[PDB]
Amino acid sequence: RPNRLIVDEAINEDNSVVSLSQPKMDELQLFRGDTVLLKGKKRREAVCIVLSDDTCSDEKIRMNRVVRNNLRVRLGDVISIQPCPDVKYGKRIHVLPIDDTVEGITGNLFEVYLKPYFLEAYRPIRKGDIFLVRGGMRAVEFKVVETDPSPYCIVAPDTVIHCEGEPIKREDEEESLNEVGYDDIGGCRKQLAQIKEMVELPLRHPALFKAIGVKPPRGILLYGPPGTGKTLIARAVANETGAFFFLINGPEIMSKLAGESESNLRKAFEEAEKNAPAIIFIDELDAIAPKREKTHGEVERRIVSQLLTLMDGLKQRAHVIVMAATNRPNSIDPALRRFGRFDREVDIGIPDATGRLEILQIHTKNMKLADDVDLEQVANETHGHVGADLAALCSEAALQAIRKKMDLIDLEDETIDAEVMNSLAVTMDDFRWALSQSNPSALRETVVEVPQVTWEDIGGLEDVKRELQELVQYPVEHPDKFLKFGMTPSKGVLFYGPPGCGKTLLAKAIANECQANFISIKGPELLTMWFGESEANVREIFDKARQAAPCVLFFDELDSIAKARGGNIGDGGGAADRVINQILTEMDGMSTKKNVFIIGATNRPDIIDPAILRPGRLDQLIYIPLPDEKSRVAILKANLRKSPVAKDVDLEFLAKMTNGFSGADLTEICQRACKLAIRESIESEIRRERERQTNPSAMEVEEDDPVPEIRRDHFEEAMRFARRSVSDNDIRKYEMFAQTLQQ
Amino acid sequence: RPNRLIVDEAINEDNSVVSLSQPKMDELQLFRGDTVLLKGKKRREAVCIVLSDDTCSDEKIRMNRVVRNNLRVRLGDVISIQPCPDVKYGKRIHVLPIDDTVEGITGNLFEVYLKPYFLEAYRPIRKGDI
Numbered sequence: 012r013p014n015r016l017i018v019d020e021a022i023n024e025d026n027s028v029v030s031l032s033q034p035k036m037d038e039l040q041l042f043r044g045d046t047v048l049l050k051g052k053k054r055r056e057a058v059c060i061v062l063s064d065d066t067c068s069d070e071k072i073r074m075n076r077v078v079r080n081n082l083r084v085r086l087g088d089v090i091s092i093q094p095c096p097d098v099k100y101g102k103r104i105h106v107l108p109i110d111d112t113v114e115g116i117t118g119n120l121f122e123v124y125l126k127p128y129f130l131e132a133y134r135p136i137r138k139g140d141i142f143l144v145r146g147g148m149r150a151v152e153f154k155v156v157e158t159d160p161s162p163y164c165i166v167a168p169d170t171v172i173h174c175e176g177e178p179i180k181r182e183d184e185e186e187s188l189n190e191v192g193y194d195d196i197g198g199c200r201k202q203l204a205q206i207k208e209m210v211e212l213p214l215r216h217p218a219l220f221k222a223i224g225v226k227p228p229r230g231i232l233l234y235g236p237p238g239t240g241k242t243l244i245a246r247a248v249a250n251e252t253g254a255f256f257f258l259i260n261g262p263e264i265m266s267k268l269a270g271e272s273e274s275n276l277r278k279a280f281e282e283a284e285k286n287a288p289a290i291i292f293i294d295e296l297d298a299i300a301p302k303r304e305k306t307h308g309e310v311e312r313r314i315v316s317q318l319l320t321l322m323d324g325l326k327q328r329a330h331v332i333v334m335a336a337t338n339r340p341n342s343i344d345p346a347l348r349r350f351g352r353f354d355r356e357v358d359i360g361i362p363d364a365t366g367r368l369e370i371l372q373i374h375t376k377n378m379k380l381a382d383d384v385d386l387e388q389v390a391n392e393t394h395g396h397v398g399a400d401l402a403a404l405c406s407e408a409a410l411q412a413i414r415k416k417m418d419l420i421d422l423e424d425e426t427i428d429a430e431v432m433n434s435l436a437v438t439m440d441d442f443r444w445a446l447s448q449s450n451p452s453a454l455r456e457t458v459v460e461v462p463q464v465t466w467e468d469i470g471g472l473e474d475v476k477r478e479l480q481e482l483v484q485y486p487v488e489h490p491d492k493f494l495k496f497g498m499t500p501s502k503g504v505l506f507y508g509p510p511g512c513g514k515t516l517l518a519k520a521i522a523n524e525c526q527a528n529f530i531s532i533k534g535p536e537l538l539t540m541w542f543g544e545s546e547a548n549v550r551e552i553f554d555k556a557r558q559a560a561p562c563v564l565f566f567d568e569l570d571s572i573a574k575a576r577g578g579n580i581g582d583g584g585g586a587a588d589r590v591i592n593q594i595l596t597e598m599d600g601m602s603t604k605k606n607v608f609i610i611g612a613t614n615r616p617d618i619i620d621p622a623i624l625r626p627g628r629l630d631q632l633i634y635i636p637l638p639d640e641k642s643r644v645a646i647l648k649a650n651l652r653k654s655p656v657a658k659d660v661d662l663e664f665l666a667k668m669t670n671g672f673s674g675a676d677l678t679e680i681c682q683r684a685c686k687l688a689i690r691e692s693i694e695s696e697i698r699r700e701r702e703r704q705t706n707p708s709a710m711e712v713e714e715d716d717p718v719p720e721i722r723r724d725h726f727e728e729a730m731r732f733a734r735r736s737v738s739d740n741d742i743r744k745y746e747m748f749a750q751t752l753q754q
Numbered sequence: 755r756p757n758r759l760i761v762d763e764a765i766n767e768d769n770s771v772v773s774l775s776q777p778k779m780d781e782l783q784l785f786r787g788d789t790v791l792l793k794g795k796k797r798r799e800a801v802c803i804v805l806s807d808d809t810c811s812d813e814k815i816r817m818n819r820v821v822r823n824n825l826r827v828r829l830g831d832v833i834s835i836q837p838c839p840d841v842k843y844g845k846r847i848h849v850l851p852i853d854d855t856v857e858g859i860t861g862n863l864f865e866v867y868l869k870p871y872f873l874e875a876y877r878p879i880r881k882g883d884i
């Protein structure tokens with residue numbers, strides 16, 4: 012490609028001149044005084060006059076700073092140059108000065124600057140061009156916004172110009188089409204990777220894709236909670252690849268006037284057809300295309316059918332990609348899912364802890380933070396937040412810093428503007444306040460994320476860990492052996508044992524080891540979904556588990572069904588069987604292709620419905636015994652991290668003494684010890700408090716407060732309240748059931 | 755300039771009271787009951803009587819609504835305060851009610867309103883105020 016050209020410094024200072032080398036000049040067949048089109052980054056064009064220069068190298072183009080600013084490039088970049096012999100002479104232009112160039116001028120710009128520069132100049136101009144004018148003592152900056160014809164015109168003696176108007180701002184707010192590259196997205200690595208994978212080819216290289224003869228995608232759905240940054244993803248992709256991003260808003264299209272709404276939508280599609288590889292973004296799709304039964308009037312049906320027709324009318328045409336955003340996948344009319352229409356579904360989920368840290372790191376860029384910010388805990392204590400909430404949090408933190416500072420009787424002379432932000436910072440207290448006065452918007456949304464509990468957190472249980480890593484790790488890492496040998500891997504494991512032995516810890520540990528998502532369905536929700544809603548909820552939870560593979564779906568307190576079934580009511584039995592039967596039907600519909608692992612946990616195995624325990628469904632049964640000896644020491648050490656452990660004492664004898672104790676009792680003892688220590692510390696502090704009030708000026712020197720003396724005596728007093736969580740007969744029942752299992 | 759102060763909401767609802775902190779009185783040698791001269795925006799002017807109050811901050815001045823509208827300033831702005839000891843007892847006063855406040859009274863306003871309000875008050879006034 013003999014069009015790519017690296018940039019270089021220019022010799023002459025004229026605005027509309029670039030120096031070209033003779034070999035390229037003859038190669039490209041250019042002549043003196045001609046006009047060419049210069050294309051740079053961020054979709055910027057430029058018109059110039061080609062000039063010859065032997066000094067400039069072939070690979071380098073000599074060009075000045077004004078054109079570099081106009082094209083938004085820098086030294087060492089690449090700019091393509093194309094001949095432009097079809098330039099049309101202009102007839103009228105509009106020129107306006109920038110805001111920060113006419114301070115205290117108060118004169119007519121037509122004769123002082125415009126007339127000397129534009130006489131016999133023949134300088135072509137284009138929209139968006141920023142150029143500098145040198146005159147008496149100030150460098151006047153001018154902006155050309157209107158021309159005829161547009162955007163190509165040439166200054167001629169028989170032309171009329173006008174410079175009457177208010178001094179326009181620098182670039183107003185036109186930062187979106189220059190900003191929001193890939194540097195402005197955090198915590199969306201996989202989704203962004205998929206979008207880049209499946210969109211780069213149809214937008215970057217259309218000719219090759221046409222030549223191949225393969226159908227491109229024609230629709231992509233981005234569904235997620237509001238404020239997670241979907242339109243920002245679309246804007247970033249369109250602005251990066253290079254296209255004609257053309258946004259359509261839902262509500263504005265809806266209520267235009269009576270029956271003329273579809274005319275605007277058709278005009279939008281027609282405009283996008285004519286104007287090169289472009290991306291059409293439809294926002295709030297559910298607002299215009301809800302479910303068919305939901306619609307009551309007739310205009311809505313007309314709008315939906317018009318959208319469907321215009322979608323099916325995209326056969327070949329050009330390289331147009333349609334992207335839509337919606338809140339809930341089932342809220343869209345199911346007719347908008349056939350092949351040819353929206354078919355590819357991408358899920359933008361709530362950010363996780365690392366995602367929250369990345370978002371916070373991105374946003375806190377203009378602010379000059381103090382040397383006390385440790386955003387790790389600030390991120391990890393904000394579960395249930397989206398991007399917009401974090402942006403609002405940063406804004407409120409800055410405003411609260413202003414509040415704690417104030418313009419102290421500072422007369423607002425506009426002089427105190429730059430030292431406002433360049434004197435201040437942020438401290439923990441501001442962010443803690445903002446967190447306190449915050450309104451999370453996620454709350455009740457199922458969280459999909461890799462848990463952080465490792466094998467070290469649990470203690471002992473070597474055989475059970477071995478069995479789980481056997482049943483989970485091998486089929487995913489060495490599937491070739493299973494395929495060649497011809498076996499079906501197991502699909503479910505059921506944990507049964509006395510309560511509080513650490514089943515969910517083990518499930519989260521294996522989820523962390525496998526590096527797969529985790530979804531927890533607790534007992535209360537399962538019991539709730541009896542009364543009505545016995546089909547939907549199960550449907551979307553299984554669908555979400557499937558689509559985000561790999562994952563380890565967890566069902567806790569599975570016996571609660573028949574536990575609530577038995578009693579003085581006997582009315583949830585139909586609800587019980589319907590819930591269990593949707594569970595069973597969805598479980599049998601699984602396919603081995605997706606690595607979806609089901610784990611159920613219960614503490615009363617004698618009551619579970621026997622239909623579950625069949626091949627294909629949950630089959631393997633693993634028994635979790637009570638911790639013993641080394642397990643007790645391991646769990647005591649695991650609970651013994653804290654910040655204030657001091658040097659402390661041995662833990663062996665504590666494990667030796669307790670016999671018939673589960674994890675709940677040990678955690679209870681650990682909490683009791685810390686409670687006693689804190690009570691002692693606070694009463695000592697209060698003693699110091701009223702002894703200072705008794706004796707003023709007694710402790711003018713800042714004597715050290717009592718240390719974290721977590722003493723043996725405090726532990727021995729606290730754990731004195733030792734409770735036996737589990738009875739004894741339950742162990743016999745469990746062991747009898749286990750012996751019944753073995754034959 | 756340690757003379758100006760920022761206006762603030764007050765608690766005393768009398769028309770001729772202001773609330774200053776004791777350090778302000780210590781700095782400006784301000785007693786209790788003296789006559790102070792208040793300058794504000796639009797070149798408006800009024801006089802008042804200084805009263806002690808510890809609730810307000812040192813940089814903050816508390817003042818009621820009638821004086822605030824007299825000075826043509828809103829809360830959050832700045833005013834200039836100084837001692838004004840050259841005031842002496844007046845001789846004659848000419849007062850006239852506003853049109854859209856006396857619709858349907860038709861009585862001796864002197865015995866009804868002015869006599870109790872001006873009684874044993876020693877309220878300083880300046881021409882043009884309301």
Ligand SMILES: Nc1ncnc2c1ncn2[C@@H]1O[C@H](COP(=O)(O)OP(=O)(O)O)[C@@H](O)[C@H]1O
Nearest residue numbers: 195196197237238239240241242243398399402
């Ligand atoms: N990396 C990011 N992830 C999610 N949201 C972000 C990110 N960076 C910025 N945002 C926020 O997203 C907002 C724009 O997204 P928005 O228009 O709310 O999407 P939608 O309209 O789909 O909710 C911006 O105001 C910005 O504060």
Ligand SMILES: Nc1ncnc2c1ncn2[C@@H]1O[C@H](COP(=O)(O)OP(=O)(O)O)[C@@H](O)[C@H]1O
Nearest residue numbers: 469470510511512513514515516646674675678
């Ligand atoms: N390996 C272990 N052995 C015993 N107890 C543990 C172990 N690991 C963690 N624990 C403690 O036991 C508790 C387990 O509670 P949980 O597993 O939620 O109850 P359940 O066992 O009924 O699901 C946790 O609070 C944890 O601190």
